[PDB]
Amino acid sequence: PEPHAVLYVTNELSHIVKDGFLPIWKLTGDESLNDLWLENGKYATDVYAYGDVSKWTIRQLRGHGFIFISTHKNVQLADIIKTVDVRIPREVARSHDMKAFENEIGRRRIRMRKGFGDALRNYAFKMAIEFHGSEAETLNDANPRLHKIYGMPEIPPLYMEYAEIGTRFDDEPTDEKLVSMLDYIVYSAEEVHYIGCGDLRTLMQFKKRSPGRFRRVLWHVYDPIAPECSDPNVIVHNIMVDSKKDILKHMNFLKRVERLFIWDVSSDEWETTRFAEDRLGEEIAYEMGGAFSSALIKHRIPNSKDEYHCISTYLFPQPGADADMYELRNFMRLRGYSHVDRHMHPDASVTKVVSRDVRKMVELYHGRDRGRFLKKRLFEHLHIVRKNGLLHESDEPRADLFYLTNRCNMGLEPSIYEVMKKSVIATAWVGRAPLYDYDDFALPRSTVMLNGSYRDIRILDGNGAILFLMWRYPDIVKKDLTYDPAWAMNFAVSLKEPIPDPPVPDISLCRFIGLRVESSVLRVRNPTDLSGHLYVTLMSGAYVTDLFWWFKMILDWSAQNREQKLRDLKRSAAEVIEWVRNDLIAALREYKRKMGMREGASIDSWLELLRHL
Ligand SMILES: Nc1nc2[nH]cnc2c(=O)[nH]1
Ligand SMILES: Nc1nc2[nH]cnc2c(=O)[nH]1
């Protein structure tokens, strides 16, 4: 809505910037601290800035809005030697196109979005178990035997009771059928009896792309034609399978384990053998249902039969599989130990299927050049627990990232705060620009600031949030981390995180970039300094800081003295950018003088927490 970034470039770039349409900020390594803060605050959009910044730490620079573009790998600071956020290729200076240069920034900026949500997420996996509004990404980095991953994924093309299909959605190519299979089914298994594994090329390429989960899992594999695979998490079996006893003897029963049954069995005049193969793969899974957690039975569709039967939880189309591949994979969820509770997905039963409706599924969703987006949906739907965030009442501690402010939740505002009163970590869209690849809606920043802050609950904007994590848990959140602060500043973030002792004015907390331009607009438009300053912050909705702590920082902390208060900075390894209650109490008042109803309680809460402290 207001928040910008300083697109910082290194010397050799500068000349081309001049030729742009955005404001340029020039340095000049002196510049006091309180110099940057007043200048940077003049820029109501993104800026370009160059020249010497040796004096300064990174935190200092990110709180200011910095993104480090250059041709060189890194740039020298006072803190450390930072990895440039945005490297430019030589040739694409160089050239000296302002446009290809400006485009080049954009892309990496959208790529930078990732790193931001990787820090918050990567902290959540540190402090939590339950998990809400999740997706493949969160599955991807989860520990399936600890974190418990809920959410509401977008349900794929399915056949059971039960039809509905389609409709079609846009999609792109992926990994060939057989490794694109493994990819979505393998997640929480611990042991896999892979029946009919062929020559193993399949599973090896699975290793070659997805190495972690290949090793975090155990593979019995079965074929007349399977070679000796030197791997030690691979016990091979040449034995062909007619009975469930050719698997059974090869499971340790004295210990609990999630086990997965994968069937893929084909041989060599009609073929109602193709049939009683699949049907067998099913019966064998079934008899064992109670030792496996689930199964992916192969399921090709016959010509002869218009309708037929099978045991099924689901039947679905196959990513990366050719268009003419007339073969669905049949899921069976089962009973048997599993670190993911799937009792939503119905207990695999007998299923009447109509060939032509399967025939249609293949027709709609198969294609070499389709699957990517299907596979995802399958993955989630299979392994996420279908549970609604604002409604789930949890016993364990719980994280709430990047779903909260979704357009489907619109109106249900109260429930939202309820979640941010008690989550470990959660985030709300508060950005007021156009604003794309993002389908969220904004919460009023004042209302966030005021409802957000509780003793335990620290309420910062994404950048503050990050700065904080850098500063408190330096190795949950690295310092060299690349991210785009502007974007970080579209999110309100909340953490179950105690106030510092002593409540130092760290950047995580105190930035207030542009608060002077912010105070003037305020006064030409809707007109009514630590008294007025608090009011500005609120009325602007430019800002999201932790009211509570910042309160505590003012009264309980300043005074203290000159000597005795920096000192307690050293120490708390804090850092700043800027070198009584009766103000604040009116600050509040004035605020709600202008805002009956559109708020604020609460307010009342805040006042009555000064008038008692
Ligand atoms: N910054 C950011 N990172 C993510 N990682 C997964 N989803 C998101 C998102 O919406 N934003
Ligand atoms: N099946 C699958 N789909 C994904 N979509 C994004 N990441 C993954 C992954 O690891 N596996």
PDB file of N, CA, C and O in Angstrom, residues 530-567:
ATOM      1  N   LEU A 530       5.966  11.888  20.525  1.00  0.00           N
ATOM      2  CA  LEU A 530       5.650  10.543  21.001  1.00  0.00           C
ATOM      3  C   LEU A 530       4.149  10.320  21.276  1.00  0.00           C
ATOM      4  O   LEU A 530       3.676   9.180  21.239  1.00  0.00           O
ATOM      5  N   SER A 531       3.426  11.417  21.556  1.00  0.00           N
ATOM      6  CA  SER A 531       1.958  11.433  21.688  1.00  0.00           C
ATOM      7  C   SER A 531       1.296  11.291  20.321  1.00  0.00           C
ATOM      8  O   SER A 531       0.557  10.318  20.082  1.00  0.00           O
ATOM      9  N   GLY A 532       1.583  12.246  19.427  1.00  0.00           N
ATOM     10  CA  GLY A 532       1.085  12.215  18.047  1.00  0.00           C
ATOM     11  C   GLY A 532       1.648  11.055  17.226  1.00  0.00           C
ATOM     12  O   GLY A 532       0.989  10.525  16.314  1.00  0.00           O
ATOM     13  N   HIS A 533       2.870  10.646  17.554  1.00  0.00           N
ATOM     14  CA  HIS A 533       3.539   9.594  16.811  1.00  0.00           C
ATOM     15  C   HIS A 533       2.761   8.296  16.846  1.00  0.00           C
ATOM     16  O   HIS A 533       2.606   7.655  15.817  1.00  0.00           O
ATOM     17  N   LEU A 534       2.271   7.917  18.023  1.00  0.00           N
ATOM     18  CA  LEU A 534       1.510   6.672  18.166  1.00  0.00           C
ATOM     19  C   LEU A 534       0.221   6.719  17.362  1.00  0.00           C
ATOM     20  O   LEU A 534      -0.153   5.759  16.691  1.00  0.00           O
ATOM     21  N   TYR A 535      -0.453   7.860  17.451  1.00  0.00           N
ATOM     22  CA  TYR A 535      -1.669   8.115  16.690  1.00  0.00           C
ATOM     23  C   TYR A 535      -1.398   7.979  15.208  1.00  0.00           C
ATOM     24  O   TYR A 535      -2.138   7.288  14.534  1.00  0.00           O
ATOM     25  N   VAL A 536      -0.336   8.611  14.707  1.00  0.00           N
ATOM     26  CA  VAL A 536      -0.030   8.523  13.284  1.00  0.00           C
ATOM     27  C   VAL A 536       0.053   7.061  12.877  1.00  0.00           C
ATOM     28  O   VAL A 536      -0.722   6.623  12.027  1.00  0.00           O
ATOM     29  N   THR A 537       0.958   6.308  13.508  1.00  0.00           N
ATOM     30  CA  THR A 537       1.072   4.852  13.278  1.00  0.00           C
ATOM     31  C   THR A 537      -0.262   4.139  13.098  1.00  0.00           C
ATOM     32  O   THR A 537      -0.410   3.346  12.183  1.00  0.00           O
ATOM     33  N   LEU A 538      -1.223   4.420  13.972  1.00  0.00           N
ATOM     34  CA  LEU A 538      -2.529   3.767  13.908  1.00  0.00           C
ATOM     35  C   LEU A 538      -3.417   4.250  12.773  1.00  0.00           C
ATOM     36  O   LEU A 538      -3.913   3.431  11.976  1.00  0.00           O
ATOM     37  N   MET A 539      -3.630   5.568  12.716  1.00  0.00           N
ATOM     38  CA  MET A 539      -4.483   6.160  11.728  1.00  0.00           C
ATOM     39  C   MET A 539      -3.938   5.827  10.325  1.00  0.00           C
ATOM     40  O   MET A 539      -4.728   5.543   9.426  1.00  0.00           O
ATOM     41  N   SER A 540      -2.611   5.764  10.143  1.00  0.00           N
ATOM     42  CA  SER A 540      -2.009   5.440   8.818  1.00  0.00           C
ATOM     43  C   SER A 540      -2.338   4.047   8.236  1.00  0.00           C
ATOM     44  O   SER A 540      -2.615   3.879   7.039  1.00  0.00           O
ATOM     45  N   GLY A 541      -2.285   3.030   9.077  1.00  0.00           N
ATOM     46  CA  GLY A 541      -2.440   1.687   8.571  1.00  0.00           C
ATOM     47  C   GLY A 541      -1.342   1.393   7.579  1.00  0.00           C
ATOM     48  O   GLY A 541      -1.407   0.416   6.837  1.00  0.00           O
ATOM     49  N   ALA A 542      -0.335   2.255   7.558  1.00  0.00           N
ATOM     50  CA  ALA A 542       0.912   1.941   6.892  1.00  0.00           C
ATOM     51  C   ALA A 542       1.676   0.905   7.718  1.00  0.00           C
ATOM     52  O   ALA A 542       2.433   0.119   7.154  1.00  0.00           O
ATOM     53  N   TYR A 543       1.458   0.869   9.038  1.00  0.00           N
ATOM     54  CA  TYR A 543       2.360   0.132   9.912  1.00  0.00           C
ATOM     55  C   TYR A 543       1.778  -0.970  10.783  1.00  0.00           C
ATOM     56  O   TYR A 543       0.646  -0.874  11.287  1.00  0.00           O
ATOM     57  N   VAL A 544       2.601  -2.008  10.973  1.00  0.00           N
ATOM     58  CA  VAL A 544       2.292  -3.152  11.854  1.00  0.00           C
ATOM     59  C   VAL A 544       3.435  -3.469  12.831  1.00  0.00           C
ATOM     60  O   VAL A 544       4.342  -4.251  12.515  1.00  0.00           O
ATOM     61  N   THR A 545       3.375  -2.868  14.018  1.00  0.00           N
ATOM     62  CA  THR A 545       4.313  -3.203  15.087  1.00  0.00           C
ATOM     63  C   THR A 545       3.601  -3.756  16.312  1.00  0.00           C
ATOM     64  O   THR A 545       2.371  -3.747  16.401  1.00  0.00           O
ATOM     65  N   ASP A 546       4.406  -4.238  17.248  1.00  0.00           N
ATOM     66  CA  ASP A 546       3.934  -4.832  18.462  1.00  0.00           C
ATOM     67  C   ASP A 546       3.678  -3.754  19.528  1.00  0.00           C
ATOM     68  O   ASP A 546       4.555  -3.410  20.344  1.00  0.00           O
ATOM     69  N   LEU A 547       2.463  -3.210  19.482  1.00  0.00           N
ATOM     70  CA  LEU A 547       1.942  -2.299  20.497  1.00  0.00           C
ATOM     71  C   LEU A 547       2.414  -2.596  21.919  1.00  0.00           C
ATOM     72  O   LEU A 547       3.014  -1.741  22.576  1.00  0.00           O
ATOM     73  N   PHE A 548       2.118  -3.798  22.403  1.00  0.00           N
ATOM     74  CA  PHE A 548       2.490  -4.190  23.760  1.00  0.00           C
ATOM     75  C   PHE A 548       3.958  -3.864  24.058  1.00  0.00           C
ATOM     76  O   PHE A 548       4.263  -2.941  24.833  1.00  0.00           O
ATOM     77  N   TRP A 549       4.855  -4.627  23.433  1.00  0.00           N
ATOM     78  CA  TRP A 549       6.287  -4.497  23.662  1.00  0.00           C
ATOM     79  C   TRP A 549       6.758  -3.043  23.485  1.00  0.00           C
ATOM     80  O   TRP A 549       7.445  -2.484  24.346  1.00  0.00           O
ATOM     81  N   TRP A 550       6.350  -2.423  22.388  1.00  0.00           N
ATOM     82  CA  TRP A 550       6.698  -1.042  22.162  1.00  0.00           C
ATOM     83  C   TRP A 550       6.204  -0.134  23.300  1.00  0.00           C
ATOM     84  O   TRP A 550       6.908   0.791  23.702  1.00  0.00           O
ATOM     85  N   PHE A 551       5.010  -0.393  23.831  1.00  0.00           N
ATOM     86  CA  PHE A 551       4.591   0.282  25.065  1.00  0.00           C
ATOM     87  C   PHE A 551       5.658   0.048  26.103  1.00  0.00           C
ATOM     88  O   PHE A 551       6.249   0.993  26.592  1.00  0.00           O
ATOM     89  N   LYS A 552       5.923  -1.226  26.396  1.00  0.00           N
ATOM     90  CA  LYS A 552       6.859  -1.602  27.446  1.00  0.00           C
ATOM     91  C   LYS A 552       8.229  -0.962  27.209  1.00  0.00           C
ATOM     92  O   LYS A 552       8.951  -0.647  28.156  1.00  0.00           O
ATOM     93  N   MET A 553       8.574  -0.742  25.945  1.00  0.00           N
ATOM     94  CA  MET A 553       9.868  -0.170  25.626  1.00  0.00           C
ATOM     95  C   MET A 553       9.928   1.298  26.017  1.00  0.00           C
ATOM     96  O   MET A 553      10.974   1.769  26.447  1.00  0.00           O
ATOM     97  N   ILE A 554       8.810   2.015  25.856  1.00  0.00           N
ATOM     98  CA  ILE A 554       8.744   3.462  26.155  1.00  0.00           C
ATOM     99  C   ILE A 554       8.838   3.803  27.639  1.00  0.00           C
ATOM    100  O   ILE A 554       9.701   4.572  28.026  1.00  0.00           O
ATOM    101  N   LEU A 555       7.945   3.243  28.448  1.00  0.00           N
ATOM    102  CA  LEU A 555       7.814   3.642  29.841  1.00  0.00           C
ATOM    103  C   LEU A 555       8.857   2.963  30.706  1.00  0.00           C
ATOM    104  O   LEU A 555       9.624   3.612  31.401  1.00  0.00           O
ATOM    105  N   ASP A 556       8.866   1.641  30.637  1.00  0.00           N
ATOM    106  CA  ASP A 556       9.743   0.810  31.435  1.00  0.00           C
ATOM    107  C   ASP A 556      11.189   0.862  31.008  1.00  0.00           C
ATOM    108  O   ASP A 556      12.044   0.337  31.722  1.00  0.00           O
ATOM    109  N   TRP A 557      11.475   1.477  29.860  1.00  0.00           N
ATOM    110  CA  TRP A 557      12.840   1.436  29.325  1.00  0.00           C
ATOM    111  C   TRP A 557      13.571   2.789  29.029  1.00  0.00           C
ATOM    112  O   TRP A 557      14.808   2.839  29.092  1.00  0.00           O
ATOM    113  N   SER A 558      12.830   3.871  28.736  1.00  0.00           N
ATOM    114  CA  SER A 558      13.457   5.134  28.258  1.00  0.00           C
ATOM    115  C   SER A 558      12.861   6.460  28.814  1.00  0.00           C
ATOM    116  O   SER A 558      11.938   7.007  28.199  1.00  0.00           O
ATOM    117  N   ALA A 559      13.354   7.015  29.934  1.00  0.00           N
ATOM    118  CA  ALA A 559      14.447   6.518  30.776  1.00  0.00           C
ATOM    119  C   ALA A 559      14.084   5.179  31.425  1.00  0.00           C
ATOM    120  O   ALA A 559      12.884   4.837  31.451  1.00  0.00           O
ATOM    121  N   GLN A 560      15.032   4.388  31.963  1.00  0.00           N
ATOM    122  CA  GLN A 560      16.536   4.449  31.967  1.00  0.00           C
ATOM    123  C   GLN A 560      17.399   5.522  31.250  1.00  0.00           C
ATOM    124  O   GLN A 560      16.905   6.350  30.432  1.00  0.00           O
ATOM    125  N   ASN A 561      18.713   5.459  31.559  1.00  0.00           N
ATOM    126  CA  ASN A 561      19.625   6.580  31.256  1.00  0.00           C
ATOM    127  C   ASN A 561      20.330   6.553  29.892  1.00  0.00           C
ATOM    128  O   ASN A 561      19.925   5.831  28.988  1.00  0.00           O
ATOM    129  N   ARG A 562      21.378   7.374  29.760  1.00  0.00           N
ATOM    130  CA  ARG A 562      22.265   7.336  28.594  1.00  0.00           C
ATOM    131  C   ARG A 562      23.225   6.142  28.733  1.00  0.00           C
ATOM    132  O   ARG A 562      23.174   5.197  27.932  1.00  0.00           O
ATOM    133  N   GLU A 563      24.075   6.186  29.759  1.00  0.00           N
ATOM    134  CA  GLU A 563      24.984   5.090  30.056  1.00  0.00           C
ATOM    135  C   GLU A 563      24.229   3.763  30.168  1.00  0.00           C
ATOM    136  O   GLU A 563      24.391   2.881  29.326  1.00  0.00           O
ATOM    137  N   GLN A 564      23.394   3.659  31.210  1.00  0.00           N
ATOM    138  CA  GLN A 564      22.728   2.409  31.631  1.00  0.00           C
ATOM    139  C   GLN A 564      21.750   1.816  30.621  1.00  0.00           C
ATOM    140  O   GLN A 564      21.161   0.768  30.894  1.00  0.00           O
ATOM    141  N   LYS A 565      21.571   2.471  29.470  1.00  0.00           N
ATOM    142  CA  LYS A 565      20.671   1.938  28.432  1.00  0.00           C
ATOM    143  C   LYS A 565      21.305   1.659  27.051  1.00  0.00           C
ATOM    144  O   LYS A 565      20.601   1.954  25.986  1.00  0.00           O
ATOM    145  N   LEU A 566      22.541   0.942  27.104  1.00  0.00           N
ATOM    146  CA  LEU A 566      23.251   0.728  25.798  1.00  0.00           C
ATOM    147  C   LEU A 566      24.641   0.035  25.673  1.00  0.00           C
ATOM    148  O   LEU A 566      25.024  -0.298  24.549  1.00  0.00           O
ATOM    149  N   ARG A 567      25.369  -0.319  26.735  1.00  0.00           N
ATOM    150  CA  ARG A 567      24.909  -1.111  27.859  1.00  0.00           C
ATOM    151  C   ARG A 567      23.840  -2.075  27.401  1.00  0.00           C
ATOM    152  O   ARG A 567      24.137  -2.911  26.560  1.00  0.00           O
TER     153      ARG A 567
END
